[PDB]
Design a protein around this ligand. Structure first.
Ligand SMILES: C[C@@H](O)CN1CCN(CC(=O)O)CCN(CC(=O)O)CCN(CC(=O)O)CC1
Ligand SMILES: C[C@@H](O)CN1CCN(CC(=O)O)CCN(CC(=O)O)CCN(CC(=O)O)CC1
Ligand SMILES: [Cl-]
Ligand SMILES: [Cl-]
Ligand SMILES: [Cl-]
Ligand SMILES: [Gd]
Ligand code: NA
Length: 128
């Protein structure tokens, strides 16, 4: 599924992401835009053999099982394929554990380089 901006904000807000660990809703929509272009089905292969999955490009090295990332962890206890669903529940619960782990939203390279220090509220501007 490719989400609209307002549609994704209302779904992330309903799953409790708004101000989660002090990160306003604008930071999360911004991250999703530059990680996946709002597409749940996005995948990107990393040079170490791990793969990034879904709207927030979560990372088979540590967070989920794709059966092809040797000696990796599954700390969200999910198949990576669950992170590609039109339902973002798995992606959101998994992101709650990542952003809680010590480095906050710096875990998302595109958030750090394209959202951090900007007018992030612009990303939910006009939404009900
Ligand atoms: C809401 C309208 O803006 C829709 N829109 C009309 C055309 N826009 C005009 C403009 O945005 O000023 C220019 C192109 N636009 C650049 C950009 O958005 O930054 C990329 C495509 N957009 C992406 C989007 O808007 O989400 C969809 C089409
Ligand atoms: C040409 C306009 O589209 C100018 N636009 C500024 C104003 N936009 C317009 C809008 O989308 O309504 C509102 C804020 N916008 C939200 C979003 O696009 O998702 C993020 C910033 N954008 C990033 C981008 O377009 O890639 C900068 C370019
Ligand atoms: Cl915001
Ligand atoms: Cl594996
Ligand atoms: Cl933090
Ligand atoms: Gd824009
Ligand atoms: Na794994």
């Amino acid at each position: 599924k490719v989400f609209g901006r307002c549609e994704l904000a209302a779904a992330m807000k309903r799953h409790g992401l708004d101000n989660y660990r002090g990160y306003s809703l604008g930071n999360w929509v911004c991250a999703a835009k530059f990680e996946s272009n709002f597409n749940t089905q996005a995948t990107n292969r990393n040079t170490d053999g791990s793969t990034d999955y879904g709207i927030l490009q979560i990372n088979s090295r540590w967070w989920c099982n794709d059966g092809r990332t040797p000696g990796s962890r599954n700390l969200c206890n999910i198949p990576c394929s669950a992170l590609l669903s039109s339902d973002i529940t798995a992606s959101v619960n998994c992101a709650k554990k990542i952003v809680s782990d010590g480095n906050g939203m710096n875990a998302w390279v595109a958030w750090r380089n394209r959202c951090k220090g900007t007018d992030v509220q612009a990303w939910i501007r006009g939404c009900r």
